[PDB]
Design a protein around this ligand. Structure first.
Ligand code: CLA
Ligand code: CLA
Ligand code: CLA
Ligand code: CLA
Ligand code: CLA
Ligand code: CLA
Ligand code: CLA
Ligand code: CLA
Ligand code: CLA
Ligand SMILES: CCCCCCCCCCCCCCCC(=O)OC[C@H](COP(=O)(O)OC[C@@H](O)CO)OC(=O)CCCCCCCCCCCCCCC
Lengths: 78, 80, 160, 39, 221, 741, 74
């Protein structure tokens, strides 16, 4: 019994981007030290976080996006 | 109550008194030793019988010697 | 907020936990036959013995050598009477040795002064005898008079 | 120089002695087995 | 050849039991570690952890440690008598004559072989006349193993345990009314050596009497 | 926050201290005046806290000793792979794994021990091993003995590398104290980098090596025409002809099209009908899933870059009304004391090894593991014994923490302080539950002995008699048997055939059956709970009463390892925290012996056995656990007397070494009681009598002979007791199961 | 019951200004108590009650699988 995994439509990428933005919002609301980081150009565009905080938010968005993409593929959304 | 008896082969090193956990022993002046003191056991009714004083005695056979006798509520060391 | 406090005196070896002495265990232990304020002995013992004789006709009536036999409830009654008599002899000799004032704890700051004497513990033992016999006979009568009473079918199907 | 003192200790020498004795007995019972008595 | 080795086992048992007994009888008045052993009498626990450690130095240690050796020697000789006479009475004397020269023949052809009708005194399929002997067999095992508790575990563990039990009694409601007249303490050191010795002994005689009687009564009965 | 800082060349590498024993302790360095010096040399050789007072030097010694221990373990593993490569029938076993026994040790013919070379099949004579190395190598995809020889060579190289690292981290570049205090980086690199990357690498191996080789093995291909695992990678056509989703590349992994990987990443659940082991697709999928989970968990803690936790504010925030202050002080406890860390890690590793034992019997991970009953019984028994030993060592090191590393200044009103404050309420209720469990677990057996002896089979606690059915465990078994398709909708079968289903059988023998639980299982599980609880009682009583008691209040100054305080207070014998470990070793022996007896009887009576062609299962003993495991006489007669008929009749056969070891363990158990029952003052006086006879013939030794100390007498007695009992049970189990299995 | 016990504890006892906050109470009572609850009952109706009236069992197992309309949320 395959879980109907939905091989790569554009809604998968849109959901991944949306959950990355959700991780941005959650980390901007809930993190304790987001300003730690060596350097990155354009700190105003990146919300004033350093590079490891950027990697943490993008990784958490990838976990959330993978979870919701597989879940909504198994349900039949997207 | 136990009997803590101190014999005359005592060098007055005070190790038995410092080893005693219930203040049974003390030092009295004594003319028969180089250190000028010998152990005495006045409040030997508080002796539990642990023989820590007999452990710390540096004589070939111990100048302080504990004889376990009648058992009281202090010899048993009972909090109840 | 420390819900686990001492009883007011920290160097006494006890703690006032919720189970020990909070609000609902100070009452209902001070309101049991032991530790109740107004009762005399031969009334504390009567209540305690009645409860004990009633509860002890549960592992003798349906759990015995005769439990598959119609003599089983009667044998359970006789065994409960014998155990109550042995316990009364134990209470009587415990009093006859000589009793001290009972231990005061955080749950029971006031213990019965009437149980601190040998005469009070003799009244307690006599009340325990009468209560145990009455409770055992009452449980026997209740279990025996409908002759099936399917509440006894429960916990005998378990104890098959 | 400090290694020969360690090899001269009691456990190392008792192990060497026991291995030598066991090896001598084992090499004897291989070449000359089953000697319950002297013939 | 199976009688030579058991006789030397018997000689070992008598010589060793004599060694504990002579050793404690002649060192009863005193010796190098404890010169004044006569002042404390025959039966005292120890003389403290000082002077290196002084457990079992009273002349009562001779009796206490020689009950074990006496029971072991009597076990050896009664196993000898029982197995030799079982070979004689059954009419097959060759079993003892070839299997008593090594200890697995003792362990198999005497213990395991003759415990068969013993342990089947009561089974799920019924009850024999040797059910009381199987029950005594298990009872002797239980008492003998309960002796190990007094002989291996020692006093202050149990005193520390009874202190918690005393706290639990005095702090619970409705049972702190019942107060002890004498303060519950652990069994003393000599007392517990004696209690474990008595358990070892009573279990020893009970389980061997059960095995002996059932082993030679399930066959010749 | 987390950086690498070391000291260069702190300890020179010289042999001058090799010839000076006792250099690590000041008291041991004065010279051996008595023989107690010799035993103190070994008793305090690894106690690094008593040697130096500086925690940095202690941590350096521990870090460098771990490498030497890893080198020893790698020498052992390389020796096992070398024995598989050179002195084994593994190539013969791979051809016919249903009629050839695994053997990896030949015995040299110098005396009559050539009989110990059992006839196991394929023209090979040797000892039938039960370690399960052969099934492990079959699950690893190893097809020939050269791959075992290469792994043995690699194990020797890795052992030499670990020895060089141990020399390097103590004599060339030794880390500082703050290199150990940052446990954040350590735990991140142990979760993601050791468990996560290790299970990811094993998942990749099981994808690329174990799965194709094992599918060709189960398909009926002989192992010497099976291709080597490197042309499966070099030529992906041969890798994609079976499990054809390797035709598409890695892009479905990266586009999250994981479902097309469902042919080789399954969640089948049950056992392989061909081999009796778990599906290797399930194991590869499992390792990939736990690799992702462990790598995710290894990004939790703050090391150098702001993101993460500090494991202190987690502890600081966890506080309630019943506790108050909470976990404050516990981070300093676990970052300044090595003994508290050892007590936690050893307890979790012991319970983990017990979990490993309880899991590998019910869900056998290896091909033809459940078929060979000897391997399964041996790995269960071995992992129970190792796990219980580690749990008792955890109790030991908690006791060592309490008197040597516990500081009351850092611990005011936290959890540890309050545990010390109500230790009487803890220990008394544990004592009550031990007494209750003893009565209502063992008095059931005593009652059953009595009623079976008195001719009252209807008054017993049996299935025919008064029933004691374990309704909660049966309900949980019913939940697990119906779990596939209802609460686990994407599982082909249940996790194990234990909870229900059908008899999984391979060859003619049963791999696994359902294990029905009745009155006997209820009663023996309550004995398990009872014995575990008493072991908990002794160990926890040693932990809580380690520093002080109502008997001896100044007990922390006496130390962890002291015999007694004296004959006073009635006699304060075995009061130390060490002596509670000494008693807990006896009680773990009792507990785990009952556990492995329950296993060896329940599986032999109700799981293991042959399959008749009609379909019914004829078990080894015949299902006598239902009626005989309720009585002590049934355990003595139908288990100990009946199943030791193989170990005592093994003489003159290939299993006679097991009868020899059976008698040897009986000897060592009886030998233990000389040390356990007697005391030091007997033996000191006996040695005094021997010293005069030596003095008479000028045979006075310079090192004066002393009797063993009281703690050492107890240690020798308990080590001999455990050794003699465990060797006895090992011999009995292995000779029974190598004859009936 | 646990909420009522909790709001008698002095940590969670609301202040007098919270009780007399009429503007927030009205907003959360019209939007949440009256609007969100009616929206949730609409969700139950279109998800459970209307398909069970049409013979389609839903339950808690199939409401993520049975789509209430053939054109669902498009
Ligand atoms: C709101 C979006 C969304 C939806 C509807 C789903 C839906 C589902 N998830 Mg899920 N998941 C999500 C977000 C979501 N998830 C997120 C945010 C995470 C954390 C990264 C996960 C991580 C995840 C795990 C760990 C598991 C599921 C699984 C499940 C399935 C069964 C859940 C169950 O047992 O009941 C189901 C398809 C399970 C499955 O079978 O896949 C399972 O193993 N999900
Ligand atoms: C071994 C345990 C045991 C057994 C088998 C029983 C069995 C019995 N008890 Mg008993 N009982 C027990 C322990 C036991 N009791 C204990 C521990 C207490 C104290 C909580 C009670 C308190 C108690 C009361 C208050 C009553 C019973 C009653 C009963 C009877 C019917 C049970 C019922 O209503 O089930 C459904 C039965 C003879 C009843 C009885 O005796 O009436 C004749 C009844 O009124 N028992
Ligand atoms: C302590 C009692 C003892 C006794 C009296 C013996 C005596 C014997 N054993 Mg032994 N045995 C014992 C205990 C003992 N054993 C135990 C503890 C084990 C179990 C591990 C065994 C297991 C065992 C086996 C398996 C074998 C023997 C054999 C031998 C025999 C000759 C051994 C040999 O190499 O001689 C020859 C040795 C010499 C001639 C010595 C030469 C070298 C010396 C040291 C130097 C001399 C310089 C001048 C001999 C009858 C062997 C035999 O032949 O069986 C009958 C045999 O195969 N034994
Ligand atoms: C991904 C990074 C990484 C990896 C592979 C490990 C792996 C290991 N460390 Mg290590 N460690 C790391 C980084 C790493 N560490 C960090 C950053 C810290 C510093 C804060 C520590 C500090 C630390 C201490 C102080 C201890 C360990 C120990 C261990 C060993 C555990 C024993 C075992 O089961 O070995 C089985 C696994 C293997 C043999 C695989 C080896 C993989 C190689 C090295 C690559 C193992 C070799 C312990 C040990 O045994 O010391 C040797 C120990 O004492 N480590
Ligand atoms: C740490 C483990 C690890 C490692 C090093 C490998 C190694 C590799 N994988 Mg991979 N693989 C792994 C985990 C691993 N994999 C797991 C967990 C999955 C499941 C998601 C797969 C699924 C997989 C597929 C589907 C394929 C690879 C393939 C490849 C190869 C890359 C292309 C090439 O060299 O040709 C290489 C051998 C490709 C290949 O060439 O296979 C032979 C291929 O098509 N892998
Ligand atoms: C029922 C028990 C319980 C309760 C009441 C709390 C309460 C607390 N946890 Mg939690 N937590 C618990 C068990 C619990 N936890 C368990 C079992 C784990 C380990 C797996 C964690 C792991 C954990 C971490 C990692 C953190 C908290 C923290 C928190 C705090 C904020 C609540 C939050 O976001 O996490 C609620 C989480 C759960 C209910 C789970 C709060 C004091 C945070 C903290 O330190 O706050 C100061 C934080 O950093 N928790
Ligand atoms: C068969 C051997 C044996 C037996 C009987 C015991 C008995 C006991 N051990 Mg153990 N123990 C043993 C050997 C034994 N041990 C040895 C070898 C050592 C290892 C060194 C110790 C050391 C030890 C320690 C370290 C501890 C114990 C504890 C306990 C108690 C557990 C509580 C319990 O089960 O109560 C129930 C009693 C039983 C199950 C025994 C059988 C009794 C039956 C069921 C009842 C029959 C009574 C009968 C009807 C009375 C009427 C007869 C009348 C004529 C008097 C119990 C008294 C623990 C303890 O006391 O704390 C709770 C503990 O701390 N043991
Ligand atoms: C959106 C968030 C939210 C929601 C859902 C609630 C919910 C509620 N608040 Mg609350 N409140 C909130 C936030 C919220 N409040 C805020 C932020 C403030 C702070 C200013 C307050 C301050 C506050 C106060 C001070 C009080 C409440 C109270 C209550 C309860 C009202 C009584 C009740 O249960 O009637 C529920 C009634 C309905 C859902 C139906 C209302 C009547 C309908 C519209 C008529 C038609 C019915 C319809 C035909 C359906 C029929 C049913 C069916 C059988 C056919 C209710 C649980 C009281 C309380 O403590 O209760 C525990 C109270 O004392 N709240
Ligand atoms: C607050 C009430 C509420 C809630 C909680 C839900 C919940 C949901 N609705 Mg919705 N529904 C509601 C109101 C509600 N509905 C109303 C007001 C309407 C009428 C316009 C609908 C009409 C509707 C349709 C047509 C569908 C959903 C679907 C969904 C699901 C989308 C999430 C998912 O994983 O897929 C989810 C179960 C979808 C669904 O069931 O797919 C699984 C779907 O296609 N809903
Ligand atoms: C799972 C274990 C059940 C634990 C009982 C929970 C109850 C429990 O967790 O209480 C909850 C309470 C937690 O208190 P706080 O809210 O202060 O906790 C804050 C925590 O975060 C710790 O700081 O713990 C205590 O007060 C300990 C009392 C245990 C005293 C009861 C004895 C429990 C042992 C006997 C029961 C054994 C049942 C075992 C079944 C396997």
């Amino acid at each position: 019994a395959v879980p109907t995994t939905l091989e790569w439509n554009l809604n998968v990428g849109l959901t991944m981007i949306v959950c990355n933005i959700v991780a941005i919002a959650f980390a901007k609301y809930t993190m304790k030290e987001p300003g730690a980081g060596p350097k990155l150009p354009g700190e105003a565009f990146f919300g004033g976080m350093g590079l490891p905080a950027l990697l943490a938010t993008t990784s958490f968005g990838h976990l959330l996006g993978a979870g919701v993409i597989l879940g909504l593929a198994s349900l039949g959304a997207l | 109550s136990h009997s803590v008896k101190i014999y005359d082969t005592c060098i007055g090193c005070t190790q038995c008194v410092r080893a005693c956990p219930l203040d049974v022993l003390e030092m009295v002046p004594w003319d028969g030793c180089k250190a000028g003191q010998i152990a005495s056991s006045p409040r030997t009714e508080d002796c539990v019988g642990c023989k820590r004083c007999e452990t710390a005695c540096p004589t070939d056979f111990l100048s302080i010697r504990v004889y376990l006798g009648a058992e009281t509520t202090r010899s048993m060391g009972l909090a109840y | 907020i420390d819900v686990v406090n001492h009883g007011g005196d920290p160097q006494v070896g006890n703690l006032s936990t919720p189970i020990n002495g909070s609000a609902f265990t100070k009452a209902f232990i001070n309101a049991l036959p032991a530790y109740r304020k107004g009762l005399s002995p031969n009334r504390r013992g009567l209540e305690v013995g009645m409860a004990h004789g009633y509860l002890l006709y549960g592992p003798f009536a349906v759990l015995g050598p005769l439990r598959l036999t119609e003599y089983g409830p009667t044998a359970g009654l006789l065994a409960t009477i014998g155990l109550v008599s042995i316990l009364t002899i134990c209470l009587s000799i415990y009093g006859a040795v000589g009793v001290s004032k009972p231990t005061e704890t955080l749950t029971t700051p006031e213990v019965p002064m009437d149980l601190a004497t040998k005469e009070g513990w003799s009244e307690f033992a006599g009340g325990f005898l009468l209560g145990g016999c009455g409770g055992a006979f009452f449980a026997f009568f209740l279990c025996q008079t409908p002759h099936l009473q399917p509440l006894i079918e429960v916990a005998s199907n378990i104890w098959s | 120089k400090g290694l020969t003192t360690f090899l001269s200790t009691a456990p190392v020498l008792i192990t060497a002695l026991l291995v030598f004795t066991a090896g001598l007995l084992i090499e004897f019972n291989r070449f000359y087995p089953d000697l319950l008595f002297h013939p | 050849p199976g009688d030579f080795l058991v006789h030397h086992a018997i000689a070992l048992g008598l010589h060793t039991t004599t060694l504990i007994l002579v050793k404690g009888a002649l060192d009863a008045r005193g010796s190098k570690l404890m010169p004044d052993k006569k002042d404390f009498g025959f039966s005292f626990p120890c003389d403290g952890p000082g002077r290196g450690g002084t457990c079992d130095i009273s002349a009562w240690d001779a009796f206490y440690l020689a009950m074990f050796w006496m029971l072991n020697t009597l076990g050896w000789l009664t196993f000898y008598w029982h197995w030799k006479h079982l070979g004689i009475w059954t009419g097959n004397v060759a079993q003892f004559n070839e299997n008593s020269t090594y200890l697995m023949g003792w362990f198999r052809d005497y213990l395991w072989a003759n415990s068969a009708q013993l342990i089947n005194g009561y089974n799920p399929y019924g009850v024999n006349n040797l059910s009381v002997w199987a029950w005594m067999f298990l009872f002797g095992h239980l008492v003998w193993a309960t002796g190990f508790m007094f002989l291996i575990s020692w006093r202050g563990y149990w005193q520390e345990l009874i202190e918690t039990i005393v706290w639990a009694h005095e702090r619970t409601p409705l049972a702190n009314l019942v107060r002890w007249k004498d303060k519950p303490v652990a069994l003393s050191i000599v007392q517990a050596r004696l209690v474990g010795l008595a358990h070892f002994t009573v279990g020893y005689i009970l389980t061997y009497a059960a095995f002996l009687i059932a082993s030679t009564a399930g066959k010749f009965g | 926050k987390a950086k690498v800082i070391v000291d260069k060349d702190p300890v020179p590498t010289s042999f001058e201290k090799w010839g000076k024993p006792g250099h690590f302790d000041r008291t041991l360095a004065r010279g051996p005046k008595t023989t107690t010096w010799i035993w103190n040399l070994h008793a305090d050789a690894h106690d690094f806290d008593s040697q130096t007072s500086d925690l940095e030097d202690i941590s350096r010694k521990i870090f460098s000793a771990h490498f030497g221990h890893l080198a020893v373990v790698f020498v052992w593993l390389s020796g096992m792979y070398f024995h598989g490569a050179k002195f084994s029938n593994y190539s013969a076993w791979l051809a016919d794994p249903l009629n050839i026994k695994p053997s990896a040790q030949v015995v040299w013919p110098v005396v009559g021990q050539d009989i110990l070379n059992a006839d196991v099949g394929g023209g090979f004579h040797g000892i039938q091993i039960t370690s399960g190395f052969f099934q492990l190598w079959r699950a690893s995809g190893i097809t020939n003995e050269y791959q075992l020889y290469c792994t043995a060579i690699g194990g020797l190289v890795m052992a030499g590398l670990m020895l060089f690292a141990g020399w390097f981290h103590y004599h060339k570049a030794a880390p500082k104290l703050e290199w150990f205090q940052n446990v954040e980086s350590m735990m991140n690199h142990h979760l993601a980098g050791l468990l996560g990357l290790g299970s990811l690498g094993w998942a990749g191996h099981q994808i690329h090596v174990s799965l194709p080789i094992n599918k060709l093995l189960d398909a009926g291909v002989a192992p010497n025409e099976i291709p080597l695992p490197h042309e499966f990678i070099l030529d992906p056509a041969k890798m994609a002809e079976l499990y054809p989703s390797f035709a598409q590349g890695l892009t479905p992994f990266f586009t999250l099209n994981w479902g097309v990987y469902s042919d080789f990443l399954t969640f089948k659940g049950g056992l392989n009908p061909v081999t009796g082991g778990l599906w290797l697709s399930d194991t590869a999928h499992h390792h990939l899933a736990i690799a992702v989970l462990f790598i995710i968990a290894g990004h939790m803690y703050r090391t150098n870059w702001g993101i993460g936790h500090n494991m202190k504010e987690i502890l600081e925030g966890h506080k309630g009304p019943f506790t108050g202050e909470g976990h404050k002080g516990l981070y300093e406890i676990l970052t300044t004391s090595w003994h508290a860390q050892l007590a936690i890690n050893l307890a979790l590793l012991g319970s983990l090894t017990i979990i490993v034992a309880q899991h590998m019997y019910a869900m056998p991970p290896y091909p033809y593991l459940a078929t060979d009953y000897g391997t399964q019984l041996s790995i269960f028994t071995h992992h129970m014994w190792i796990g219980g030993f580690l749990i008792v060592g955890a109790g030991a090191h908690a006791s060592i923490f309490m008197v040597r590393d516990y500081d009351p200044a850092k611990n005011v009103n936290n959890l540890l302080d309050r545990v010390l404050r109500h230790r009487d309420a803890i220990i008394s209720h544990l004592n009550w539950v031990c007494i209750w469990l003893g009565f209502h677990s063992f008095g059931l057996y005593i009652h059953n002995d009595t009623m079976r002896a008195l001719g009252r089979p209807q008054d017993m606690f049996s299935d025919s008699a008064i029933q004691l059915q374990p309704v909660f465990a049966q309900w949980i078994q019913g939940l697990h048997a119906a779990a596939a398709g209802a609460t686990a909708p994407f599982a082909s079968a249940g996790v194990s055939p234990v909870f229900g289903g059908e008899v999984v059988a391979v060859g003619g023998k049963v791999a696994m059956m359902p294990i029905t639980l009745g009155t006997a299982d209820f009663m023996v599980h309550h004995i398990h709970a009872f014995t575990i609880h008493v072991t908990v009682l002794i160990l926890l009583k040693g932990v809580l009463y380690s520093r002080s008691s109502r008997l001896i209040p100044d007990k922390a100054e006496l130390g962890f390892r002291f015999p007694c305080d004296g004959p006073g207070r009635g006699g304060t014998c075995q009061v130390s925290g060490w002596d509670h470990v000494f008693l807990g070793l006896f009680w773990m022996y009792n507990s785990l012996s009952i556990v492995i007896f329950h296993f060896s009887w329940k599986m032999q009576s109700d799981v293991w056995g042959t399959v008749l062609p009609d379909g019914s299962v004829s078990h080894i003993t015949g299902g006598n656990f239902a009626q005989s495991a309720i009585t002590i006489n049934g355990w003595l007669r139908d288990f100990l007397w009946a199943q030791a008929a193989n170990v005592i009749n093994s003489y003159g056969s290939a299993l006679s070494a097991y009868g020899i070891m059976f008698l040897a363990g009986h000897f060592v158990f009886a030998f233990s009681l000389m040390f356990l029952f007697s005391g030091r003052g007997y033996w000191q006086e006996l040695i005094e009598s021997i010293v005069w006879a030596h003095n008479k013939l000028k045979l006075a030794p310079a090192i004066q002979p002393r009797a063993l100390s009281i703690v050492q007498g107890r240690a020798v007695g308990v080590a001999h007791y455990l050794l003699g009992g465990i060797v006895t049970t090992w011999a009995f189990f292995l000779c029974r199961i190598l004859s009936v299995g | 019951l646990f909420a009522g016990w909790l709001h008698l504890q002095p940590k969670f006892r609301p202040s007098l200004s919270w009780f007399k906050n009429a503007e927030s109470r009205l907003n959360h009572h019209l939007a949440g108590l009256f609007g969100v609850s009616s929206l949730a009952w609409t969700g139950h109706l279109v998800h459970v009650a209307i398909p069970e009236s049409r013979g389609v069992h839903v339950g808690w197992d199939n409401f993520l699988s049975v789509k209430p309309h053939p054109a669902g949320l498009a």
